[PDB]
Design a protein around this ligand. Structure first.
Ligand SMILES: Nc1ccccc1-c1cnco1
Ligand SMILES: Nc1ccccc1-c1cnco1
Lengths: 205, 215
């Protein structure tokens, strides 16, 4: 049984993932503006030390996490400056009772929010890849998907084929129709080797 | 002006593209994003898009016939066909910059155990095709990757190294935690330096690979 709370100023981004799950795991989405202070519902402010963009306010985020998090919570913060989120990470988090995902803008959440939370609960700042998003919402979607599909409920993969055996002048590799399953395995292994060399030589060292 | 077509068996799942950066870009007319139900190109009553794999293995493979018809209608020779897949070349910031100047992106979202390889092979005889991974984690399908790609690319469209260090804003003291004094000093040189040192610490600790170190 896993509970996921997402906090975001774009709550509608996450509805189409909440309404996708089967046997209700529970996924709840919260509008950050619930915890604003002022009639203007301000969530960000100018960065100390100058610079472009805006930093998300610690007083707002602090109130939101205070309400939603407990000592058992794993607080996940998608950020370009995060540790890499991997399948290993997904496996670890799949056994957790409570994930809270804090979605911020690219510019960031005041660092004191995470630092303060970390004195009471486990906090994980994570990046899903080396590209820049405008905010953490899309990364939250990726994390939610990768984690939840592992909830009870190396080399690259090579090419796959299905019917028909011949399509637009291209035949399915005859070995796959051979009924020689040791040979098929060996062929697939060689396809995986070639593809890993070509596309992901980093995986080979 | 850019056109993005997304083809998926879950068109409703691509509706998050309607807010945030992408939504604003669409509203401002800098991009048009159209989502297509793959099952529109089926002809049987059960609208079957998948079948069991040749050679054996777990799960199902998406049929080339349906994809071929869909891509025939949506793509031209100028199209950049994007296929998210765990076995793809890495999608990076460099890729996002490159695709940001494209006139037409078509994103094919796969489900089950993948799309028959001949779909990509056939398309490549007629247009540029890019199979890409957005990271080494396993998704159920290409839909979430499409959303990531769209966001990363659209924020670079005209009109729309080292890790970033910590950022701070008001108030200067919060829960007994103070903003680093150097940031309040207005000394642009000392601030630039502190920020450089923070990023170094963070990059070495979290992403040593960026600086050419192990793990
Ligand atoms: N660029 C970002 C901006 C804001 C929140 C997360 C990210 C992110 C996470 N992984 C890659 O990018
Ligand atoms: N795992 C997947 C399954 C289907 C379509 C894309 C992916 C993917 C791409 N990059 C990471 O995951």
């Amino acid at each position: 049984s896993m509970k996921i709370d997402v906090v975001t100023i774009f709550p509608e981004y996450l509805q189409p993932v909440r309404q996708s799950l089967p046997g209700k795991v529970d996924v709840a989405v919260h509008d950050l503006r619930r915890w604003t202070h002022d009639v203007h519902k301000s969530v960000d402010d100018s960065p100390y030390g100058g610079g472009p963009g805006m930093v998300m306010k610690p007083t707002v985020w602090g109130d939101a996490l205070d309400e939603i998090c407990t000592s058992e919570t794993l607080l996940v913060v998608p950020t370009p400056a995060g540790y890499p989120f991997t399948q290993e990470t997904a496996w670890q988090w799949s056994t957790e009772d409570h994930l809270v995902i804090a979605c911020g803008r690219y510019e960031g959440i005041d660092q004191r929010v995470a630092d303060d939370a970390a004195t009471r609960m486990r906090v994980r700042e994570v990046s899903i890849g080396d590209y820049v998003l405008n905010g953490g919402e899309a990364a939250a979607l990726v994390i939610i998907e990768a984690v939840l599909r592992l909830v009870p409920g190396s080399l690259l993969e090579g090419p796959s084929y299905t019917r028909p055996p011949s399509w637009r002048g291209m035949d399915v590799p005859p070995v796959l129709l051979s009924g020689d399953h040791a040979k098929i395995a060996a062929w697939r292994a060689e396809q995986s080797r070639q593809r890993t060399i070509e596309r992901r030589p980093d995986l080979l060292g």
